[PDB]
Amino acid sequence: AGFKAGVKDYRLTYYTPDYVVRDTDILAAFRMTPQPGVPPEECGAAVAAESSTGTWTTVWTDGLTSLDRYKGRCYDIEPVPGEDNQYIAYVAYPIDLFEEGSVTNMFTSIVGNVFGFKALRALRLEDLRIPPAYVKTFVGPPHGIQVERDKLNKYGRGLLGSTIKPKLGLSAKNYGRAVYECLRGGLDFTKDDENVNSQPFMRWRDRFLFVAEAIYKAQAETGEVKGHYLNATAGTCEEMMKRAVCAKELGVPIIMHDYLTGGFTANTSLAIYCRDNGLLLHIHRAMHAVIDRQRNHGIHFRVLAKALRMSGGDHLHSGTVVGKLEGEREVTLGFVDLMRDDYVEKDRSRGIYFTQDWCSMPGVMPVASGGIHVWHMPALVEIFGDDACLQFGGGTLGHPWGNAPGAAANRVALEACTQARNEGRDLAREGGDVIRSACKWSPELAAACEVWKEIKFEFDTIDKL
Amino acid sequence: AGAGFKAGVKDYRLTYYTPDYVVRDTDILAAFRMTPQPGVPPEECGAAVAAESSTGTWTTVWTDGLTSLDRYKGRCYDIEPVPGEDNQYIAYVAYPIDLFEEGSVTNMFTSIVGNVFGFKALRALRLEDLRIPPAYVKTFVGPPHGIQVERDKLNKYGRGLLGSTIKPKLGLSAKNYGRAVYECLRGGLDFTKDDENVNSQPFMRWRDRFLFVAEAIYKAQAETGEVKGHYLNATAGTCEEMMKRAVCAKELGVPIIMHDYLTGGFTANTSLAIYCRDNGLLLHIHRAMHAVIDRQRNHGIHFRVLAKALRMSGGDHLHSGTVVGKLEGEREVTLGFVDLMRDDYVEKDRSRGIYFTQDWCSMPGVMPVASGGIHVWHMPALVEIFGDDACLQFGGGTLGHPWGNAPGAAANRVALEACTQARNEGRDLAREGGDVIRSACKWSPELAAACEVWKEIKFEFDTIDKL
Amino acid sequence: AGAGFKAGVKDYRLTYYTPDYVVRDTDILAAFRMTPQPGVPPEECGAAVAAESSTGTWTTVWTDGLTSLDRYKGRCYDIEPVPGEDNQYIAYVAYPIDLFEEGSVTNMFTSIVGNVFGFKALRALRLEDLRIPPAYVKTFVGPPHGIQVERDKLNKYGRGLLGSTIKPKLGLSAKNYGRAVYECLRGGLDFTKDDENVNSQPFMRWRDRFLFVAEAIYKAQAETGEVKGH
Amino acid sequence: IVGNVFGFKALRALRLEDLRIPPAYVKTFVGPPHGIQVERDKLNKYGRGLLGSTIKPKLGLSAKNYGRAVYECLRGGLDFTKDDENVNSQPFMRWRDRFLFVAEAIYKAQAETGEVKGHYLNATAGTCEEMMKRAVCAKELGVPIIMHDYLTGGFTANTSLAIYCRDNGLLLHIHRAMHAVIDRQRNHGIHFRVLAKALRMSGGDHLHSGTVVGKLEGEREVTLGFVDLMRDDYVEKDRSRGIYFTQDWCSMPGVMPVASGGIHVWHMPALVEIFGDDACLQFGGGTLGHPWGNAPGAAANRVALEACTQARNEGRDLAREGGDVIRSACKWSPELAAACEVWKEIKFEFDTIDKL
Amino acid sequence: MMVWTPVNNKMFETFSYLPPLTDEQIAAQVDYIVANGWIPCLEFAEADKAYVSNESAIRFGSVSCLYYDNRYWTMWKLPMFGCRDPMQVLREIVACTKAFPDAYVRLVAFDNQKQVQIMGFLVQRPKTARDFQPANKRSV
């Protein structure tokens, strides 16, 4: 076959419905909305082409290589029930297409250009199947759940944390004051708010120092290991590393990074630094909902969660289901298993399009945070189980008696629920009873129960299956 | 007693909705297109966005009393109803300059778009514009060189620059890459480029490519007598790898590298931009992933904001869309952000999607790059839309020429130079465009061959990202 | 025929005296107390100061045409007579923010006070004040800590800090320096200090001092229970 | 010596007039990176003053236009051009772009004329690290010379820069920006001769000395006094020139005086008479203000300098016959004549403030 | 299929891929300079200094990125500041090429608001230049 210049349909090369996928192929499930007059087959074939080897007209240089070996292949198109113009297109990518160890590269191919094509109205990436052969090329999480628990000496319950509030405006000294009072009352962790980096009102190194004082005071006072997620997120990789290094030199357990606003390139770098220096890495998902909120267009969070596990993180924010930020139950149980488990079977009722084998790559601790309080505890413990961190910012610093009683309230609640579940009680049915018995026993808890009794967040879900 | 601590939940509007607030000239301003859930007042929804992107949380905290919330709070100072929409509002928010880390686009994004897009209380949220005040602009290194300096270094004036992405995207060997590069450059293109996803892979490792490309660059430059370059991709999995790739380019003495700033990220990109400033490399920016964020009208972040963010973080070129090519970009929307990329001072103009007057306080301009699904017949329209201060890229439009890359390159170069000459002589390209191209296909065999292959090829679809 | 290049000397005031100029909020402003030579008008003298601290020299240069002098030039925009003085004026000068290297006080001083104080055409010149606009302030790292943070690190509130310079200024050994430091700090002072001219000298090398002082600081701190420094 | 005493309530004014630096203290200093003899040897330039020019306008020129102006100046007969004291790195022109374009210009001029060329690239910066970065780039470009503003940058940074220059073979041009804040008034401050001695100890290959005849103040006898202090090994007490102490430099290299500011072709005889050959004469406006451009401007100043040097060598008295030498030269050279015509009537004659 | 020749086919930036400019075409480009208020200027170079080269880099550490010799040409007189007469520009082209008949000569124009060269093309090449092809000998 010779070189013939000109435009032909993408489907002639890139739609391959009889293709048997290889166990080393990267698979992608795209929820696709074609323009009127564009066949599903041509639209799926265009997505496969422009995210792998092809462009809009035939190039002679294809003949110098083997297009069969390298091309992405749309190998299946599924109609969406309940939709007139939506399809799931399945694309298979040869493992040879991808830079080893680079989440950045994987994204650049799979979501690089195809979302801006005139020929489609909307596109969403729903899921990716990352084969063992590609997973193994990644360093992955610096520690993962088991190692984190072992280093912290914390077992048999969820971890408890808190974001210091107000988000911005507190001085370094006041920051450490707030931290000390939270930690000493029963919380395992406190954290820098995602947008607390280094600012006129509080420079990072002043914060780190005062916070280290607060960690050590609370640890000596309580006899339990404490930490505070010190934010290494910065404008440049060099600043980010400078902050990681200071944490290392203070001997503190844990730093944090905003992996989407900082980026995958900086995040992978940070995760390798943590691995080599023994720091835990908490990941904040700032910006994700810009990408993942709408059903018709973007990238589903489960894919952003897979990307983080490969890039590296010991904790990742998972949503609460019941709090101020959106997260449907079945969707959330789905990607939580993807974050924590070694092997997750295909399950479309939870949004899992592909069986995922993590090949012993460590699991990432889910963090439930945002608009949650004591009355949510039974529901949180029931959804997440022990291997989660539960964070209460307003739910601690909004306590009428201050940070330490607020921390003690949340710790009592969590331990009461844990004990009740261990005794065989069903938290889905008896959760209110567990909390009420505990508010009657503990004055700190009772004070929190009273303030937030009527507070619920119940709205129509946007990101529906 | 005065104002004490009262625990519990109150409306965000009590603190964060301030319709009488006069914005300061140092405030960062945001324009959000906001779709509230039923039963949520627009005022409360705007206040919630203001609060949760600045100082506030869901319940009252005692620690506010230790600081001055008046000084630090974000403020929803104006709410505009959207014409043609039942449940859409433009909410305007002002942020004190004190909230932001100097020189960090990462931090600006973390505050302004960090958590608010996922609030249960809204159905959709889109950031349409940002007013970056000079006081904040001045904290950024910004573009390594910018348009004037780039042109001065390359000694290229009086026309658009021409480029081409090597194809197929993936699967060529380093030696075949350099071969294709040399044939493109020698035919009259100023630049070639690595595809956005060409980094380092089993079929071609990066350092092999850099070496063969350097050979190709220098061969074409010696052959044509014109300065040539190839955007070698420094995009990588880690900052250390990325820097390794940039260092190799510096050591080869080649003019220009590239970075995918959204998939690599702002923290890596800013670092690479500073490296390029210190070592005299041009930095071409690819916007891979942008349409995941910026396609839909109801939700995300408009490209003009991602373009402003890039100008701050650092880049000598940024991809701008073609309008007429295979990828979406409405004419008026595009002319608006091109001005934001290139100009020192852009006045508010809603008919081009500019919500705020933007003063760049002499921060260098970024060269817009038009790329994707374009060919010779698009040339008049491109030159009319962009003018001389743009690079026009033809991947398929060069490597898809029936006679090969060098004739492909010469066809594109002849087209560009004919249009530029016609415009200079007072011809209107918006109307005489086809005549200019037809007279040129008749004179140049190379151009004629291109004209024949792509004559009927157009990309005309309903626009999604409408004003 | 438009504005071309005309070689030769003309008055500074033709370009650099702009009394109707409305200052921008990003301009750096300078207040100069100016004493002209006899026979030099205050307007010309203020214009010379503006010119030779910004873009101008003593004769017209052709290269002006390649750039925009309107955009870059310093501007004497106001001249105030000094009450009580026969031959003194406050000349006010505005400088575009583009003239200055970000984060460099050195560069700001080099333009504003670089050459103008030596001009034959003035008898005396004094820089009285500078208006540093927020847009320029924001380019500087500034103080490592500042008053609030200092007080927070030292845990000292409710009163002025107390210090003392060790005397005699020079001539004390490193050991006697730390001995004097310890005796001061233990009595109630928060800080002691090296005299400004105590660096490293034949009578006392610096590193010997730093060690003995550290000993002294830590002994007084243990003794009093209060944070001490030197 | 000057730390606190000038602020004492018990005095109304204080001025430091001179310092006697003893050989034993002089010997503790690295001093100038090269000094006059070594500079002339490296540049292969003998038997006349060096000629230079500051690029103008002071600020506002792009990096490309900067190098363009530099190339045109150097190709016409000037040995050096220079960054203005306040040209560092600015929004209109970043330093590393300027360094690169200036290198091109230097090498083009040197190839075109066959004479060694240089341009004092300004290393002055906000921090020591930035100052070093700029010095390192000049080193890596293989250019001959950088500059520093020693009073606005400061002695600590200057001494560091001088030591870098000694170890890497760069010449160091010192600009004295801010000196007149300190040294103008007779009653209070520090006399320039002390600032000049300080610079010779701190390190510099060139130092600005004033012109006597130009737009900036500098009395003749005062100037001759400190020029000897900059250049000579041994200078005897001489109060008629403001030298309060005999100064022995114990073989410390001498610093090349730079005469700059408001000077033009008609000043040439007086400049050659005051300074002799071991000086650099700089013409900013006097080159870039020539009606025909920089190269003809450079050629005009070079012709004037060479004519004066030749005349002096032949036994003519430049103090008495200076005007005759210049006129004979304007008649011969059209470039010179054009300069002679434009600035004929231009003089700077004012009452002196810093009197002995 | 025609083959673009790599032998003696050097180019000269803007407009060098078009048929050589007639005098009427040059006049039109000058009219465009004057209509836009740009500053005309002429530059020239001897044959050995006409094309970009690398010779100075022998003196360099690793700093050759975007450094080339021969970018700068020599300025003919001064830029024509304030010139609004196209005939005046054409007269300088004549005067310049007359003074340097064996030189390469290009017409450029500057925008002083952007502070950049805004246009430029070759108006003379020496008659001894053998390193270029006519339009119809560019491919074979």
Ligand SMILES: O=C(O)[C@@](O)(COP(=O)(O)O)[C@H](O)[C@H](O)COP(=O)(O)O
């Ligand atoms: O800034 C905030 O709002 C929080 O600190 C919660 O504060 P409160 O505990 O006071 O609500 C968290 O960053 C969000 O929960 C992030 O959301 P997600 O975990 O969904 O990414």
Ligand SMILES: O=C(O)[C@@](O)(COP(=O)(O)O)[C@H](O)[C@H](O)COP(=O)(O)O
């Ligand atoms: O991968 C591609 O498709 C391209 O190389 C174009 O190839 P062709 O020239 O062969 O079409 C560009 O990266 C896109 O133009 C990017 O889109 P945008 O500029 O909109 O960001």
Ligand SMILES: O=C(O)[C@@](O)(COP(=O)(O)O)[C@H](O)[C@H](O)COP(=O)(O)O
């Ligand atoms: O900025 C200037 O004014 C100059 O460039 C002179 O320019 P012109 O040649 O155009 O006058 C010099 O820096 C001054 O001479 C310095 O004064 P001094 O040598 O006395 O320190």
Ligand SMILES: [Mg+2]
């Ligand atoms: Mg937060």
Ligand SMILES: [Mg+2]
């Ligand atoms: Mg591409």
Ligand SMILES: [Mg+2]
């Ligand atoms: Mg003292």
Ligand SMILES: [Mg+2]
């Ligand atoms: Mg100067």
